[PDB]
Amino acid sequence: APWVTIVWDDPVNLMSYVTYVFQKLFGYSEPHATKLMLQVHNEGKAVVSAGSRESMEVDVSKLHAAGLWATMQQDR
Ligand SMILES: NC(=[NH2+])NCCC[C@H](NC(=O)[C@@H](N)Cc1ccc(O)cc1)C(=O)O
Numbered sequence: 001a002p003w004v005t006i007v008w009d010d011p012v013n014l015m016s017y018v019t020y021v022f023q024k025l026f027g028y029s030e031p032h033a034t035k036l037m038l039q040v041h042n043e044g045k046a047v048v049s050a051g052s053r054e055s056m057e058v059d060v061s062k063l064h065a066a067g068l069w070a071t072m073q074q075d076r
């Protein structure tokens, strides 16, 4: 089963920072990163990447080091 990395809205990080982090960590374009940031902000969370459990563990670690609230879970 594939897994997903989820980023959760938090009250401290800047919207602008989160958009930048998605570009920096995943290479996403600015429209893509902005859309994911706004999904987190307006829905409370968003899937930001998908793949094997092991690969999502890395994405979670990278996001934590950037200061974002990230978890992973199995995709159903
Ligand atoms: N640094 C700072 N001024 N903090 C106060 C809040 C700033 C505000 N940020 C938000 O509204 C965030 N909730 C946006 C956000 C955080 C995390 C994630 O993952 C997505 C979105 C602002 O930017 O004005």
Ligand SMILES: [Mg+2]
Residues within 6 Å of the ligand: 010, 011, 041
């Ligand atoms: Mg907010």
Ligand SMILES: [Mg+2]
Residues within 6 Å of the ligand: 007, 008, 009, 010, 013, 067, 068, 069, 070
């Ligand atoms: Mg966060």
Ligand SMILES: [Mg+2]
Residues within 6 Å of the ligand: 075, 076
């Ligand atoms: Mg799903």
